[PDB]
């Protein structure tokens, strides 16, 4: 139950994480996480119902979505937990993250195809099935569409925002959640998806295993924010159309509320917080 910085994993831990992810792909379970996510990407809108993104529930929805995925990994290998990618620190293509023993590198310039690591199409082990772009190979263009990941000073500016979220509780909001998500301000989470490129820049972004490591670090930033602001908590707290209030349940699970997900320690701890 401890989530570790990707940069600190041992060779054995890297091996076991890759093997568990590849087994979930082989069995057909992985692709249904990709499909769930795309359905919510395409339905969450600023003027209508919004649950997984562009809304206060972006953070608890991804916390539970990651917990679903980690649980599925642990059904293959109980030793595995999701590692996190601190992109403010590991900000170049020569991060061991992108080594052939972990996620593989950037895509070639012709067609963006990833050519090394365990998820390269050439292995036969990572077909892209849930897709919109018709190609069936994993693609990336690290640093192609935006030339820099967020920096720690940028992260710090966002962590300093005391209000969790503000009306109208969407992509136009001020406050912490939308600055972390990235639709306003210096842009943390959205920019990272743009920086990786390939399927990570699309609605089928969980096609790239780095999705999980990116969201595990966004999830850690929510935990850090909570520590910086013990007097701040999830909002809204009741009666808000189209938005998940603190004590309302969330789709797709229907049985869990943001309130049940604010304290990550019920589920996991970080190597350091």
């Amino acid at each position: 139950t401890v989530r570790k910085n990707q940069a600190t994993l041992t060779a054995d831990e890297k091996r076991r994480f890759v093997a568990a992810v590849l087994e979930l792909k082989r069995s057909g379970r992985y692709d249904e996480f990709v499909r769930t996510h795309n359905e919510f990407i395409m339905s969450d809108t600023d003027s209508g119902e919004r649950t997984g993104h562009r809304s206060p529930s972006f953070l608890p929805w991804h916390r539970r979505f990651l917990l679903d995925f980690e649980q599925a990994l642990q059904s293959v290998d109980s030793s595995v937990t999701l590692p996190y990618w601190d992109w403010s620190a590991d900000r170049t293509v020569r991060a061991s993250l992108w080594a052939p023993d972990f996620l593989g590198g950037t895509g070639r310039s012709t067609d963006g195809r990833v050519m090394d690591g365990p998820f390269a199409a050439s292995t036969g082990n990572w077909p892209i099935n849930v897709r919109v772009d018709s190609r069936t190979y994993l693609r990336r263009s690290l640093g192609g569409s935006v030339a820099e990941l967020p920096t720690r000073a940028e992260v710090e500016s966002v962590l300093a925002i005391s209000a969790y979220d503000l009306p109208p509780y969407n992509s136009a909001s001020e406050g912490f959640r939308n600055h972390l998500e990235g639709w306003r301000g210096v842009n943390l989470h959205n920019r990272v998806h743009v920086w990786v490129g390939g399927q990570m820049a699309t609605g089928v972004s969980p096609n790239d295993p780095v999705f999980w490591l990116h969201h595990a670090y966004v999830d850690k930033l929510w935990a850090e924010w909570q520590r910086r602001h013990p007097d701040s908590a999830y909002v809204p707290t009741g009666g808000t159309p189209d938005v998940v209030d603190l004590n309302e349940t969330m789709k797709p699970w229907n049985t869990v509320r943001p309130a049940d997900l604010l304290d990550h320690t019920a589920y996991y701890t970080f190597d350091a917080l």
Partner: protein
């Protein structure tokens, strides 16, 4: 008001847009797009990267596709 319609060949491909609340096509295949509260647009193949107009979202999708047929959403 929704944006105006458009029709052009961009990088060899036909992109079309029309109010519906807005629809975009790449070579006759519908592309999911979405408008943000601030008036910017994204599509499902560039969904973390707001651009100012639906044509810009269509063009971003053609850039993303690198010649690949779009699949119907």
């Amino acid at each position: 008001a929704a944006p105006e319609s458009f029709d052009e060949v961009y990088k060899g491909r036909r992109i079309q847009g029309r109010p519906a609340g807005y629809e975009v096509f790449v070579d006759g295949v519908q592309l999911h797009v979405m408008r943000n509260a601030d008036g910017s647009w994204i599509s499902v193949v560039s969904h973390y990267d707001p651009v100012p107009t639906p044509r810009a979202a269509a063009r971003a999708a053609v850039d993303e596709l690198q010649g690949a047929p779009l699949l119907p959403f």
